């Protein structure tokens, strides 16, 4: 039975960035523990679907421990022990009782706390959820944690030069389709929607990336779903059966069909909304002394005057920081300001890299070029509602251009002339 003044439950992005903030805020040896079911210290999860899969110069632990993903210092296991912050690894909590402030591990150990930070992130929706036949065949893989990534690297090696089917057209789908093609697989991506990345992309943006990918040799099958998987006598996947009637041969299948916030330990004990744990502007739940951050939190997004849940990395880092600031502020008598987040999303495919800021609401225009067979692609999009820019996307931007579009999203400037916005889209951003 161990007690700590502060317990972070989960050892991911938000956990690590919260530890770093606790350090900055003066935490003392013996005050803080992090409990994680993973066997390693907090790391930059984004590396797992990018640099981890590169066929050379790949990312590997301990290189991508937090906080190197945002250009900060690296927090190795030794940083935590030198600060007297205890890492309790390979420990999965299976029961949380918020009244008695007690956590229980699968093996029966118990942990009590005074303040709890719920940083349990998301799990992955699985094809067993859809009732897809044969979905338990071997070499049908999902990607969330570094153990998953290691299985994937192992399959990439064992099936070298084979066929991969990627089930899903979101973030995992785009990144993994690219990764498998770069590792010399024949790759087909399958999804039900009419264009990829429906959670952000417009039809116009999606067409650029889908043409890019098919020019690289990736096949895309839209408007269908998997209905079953053939397997061999060892139970290893051999083929994906589609609802449209097509059967795709496959040595590896990777699935990216959505994440789910891991809130199940807390059902009934805290207020929920939009699938996550409802919080205030300081990441406090409906239970005092219990905070939720990162992917599990539904919080007030001040600039859009709405409750939202964000399932991306920038928010996991900044929410973690805000929570610790609020906790420390409450212990002194000190005021903290309400979280004021600008959504920042990004991804990379092959030699492409885009950034998006703000809100994808209103009607869209493109600017730049747009031609996927251009020497060096560089184009963007503005989302315009009520005469003002609410969202901005840019592929191929310099650091100054990226900062400029972020300033557009943050300040929501009015648009006088649309044709002058489309010719000179970034001149507009730079004048803001
Ligand atoms: C492969 C991959 C690539 C990504 N890349 C990007 C990207 O490029 N850009 C971007 O904006 N976003 C990206 N994301 C999303 C981003 O990483 C998440 O928003 C971020 O990790 C959320 O941080 P978190 O702390 O809330 O959760 P997570 O980092 O998932 O951390 C949750 C932690 O809690 C542990 N946990 C859960 N339940 C328990 C329990 N019961 N007991 C003990 N431990 C538990 C988990 O094992 C894990 O350590 C990506 C996600 C994935 C999966
Ligand atoms: N660059 C990034 O921001 C980035 C990269 C990797 C992962 N992630 C995160 O990791 C989590 C997992 O990503 P994800 O791509 O699984 O989810 P996502 O929410 O980004 O995409 C879900 C996708 O599942 C597909 N889908 C739904 N039903 C399906 C079906 N029946 N059959 C085939 N496809 C179906 C859709 O094409 C949809 O695009 C999310 O939180 C995501 O934000 C983010």
UniProtKB/Swiss-Prot annotation:
Top-rank lineage group of the source organism: Eukaryota
Q: Carries keyword NADP? A: yes
**Positions that bind NADP(+):** 171-175, 199, 258, 311-312, 346
* Compartments where located: Cytoplasm
User: In this UniProt entry, which cysteines form S-S bonds?
Assistant: none
Swiss-Prot/TrEMBL catalytic activity:
2 monodehydro-L-ascorbate radical + NADH + H(+) = 2 L-ascorbate + NAD(+)
The impact of changing residue 193 to A is: Reduces catalytic activity 2-fold
Q: Which cofactor does it need?
A: FAD
Q: Name one GO biological process term.
A: cellular oxidant detoxification
Under the heading InterPro entries, the entry gives: FAD-oxidoreductase/Apoptosis, FAD/NAD-bd_sf, FAD/NAD-binding_dom, FAD/NAD-linked_Rdtase_dimer_sf, MDHAR3-like_C
The stated induction of this gene product is: Down-regulated during senescence.
Gene Ontology cellular component list: cytoplasm; peroxisomal matrix
Positions bound to FAD: 11-14, 38, 45, 50, 93, 144-145, 295, 313, 346
Q: Which residues bind L-ascorbate?
A: 317, 348
Q: What is its EC number?
A: 1.6.5.4
Specify whether Amino-acid biosynthesis is a keyword of the entry: no
Major location category of this protein? cytoplasm
Enumerate the residues binding NAD(+): 169-175, 193, 199, 258, 311-312, 346
Recorded GO terms, molecular function?
Answer: monodehydroascorbate reductase (NADH) activity; mRNA binding; nucleotide binding; oxidoreductase activity, acting on NAD(P)H
Question: Which keywords are on file for this protein?
Answer: Cytoplasm, FAD, Flavoprotein, NAD, NADP, Nucleotide-binding, Oxidoreductase, Redox-active center
Family per similarity comment = Belongs to the FAD-dependent oxidoreductase family.
Described function: Catalyzes the conversion of monodehydroascorbate to ascorbate, oxidizing NADH in the process. Ascorbate is a major antioxidant against reactive oxygen species (ROS) and nitric oxide (NO). Can use NADPH as electron donor, but possesses lower activity compared to NADH as electron donor.
Specify the protein name: Monodehydroascorbate reductase 3, cytosolic
Which organism is the protein's source?
Oryza sativa subsp. japonica (Rice)
Q: What is the lineage of its organism?
A: Eukaryota, Viridiplantae, Streptophyta, Embryophyta, Tracheophyta
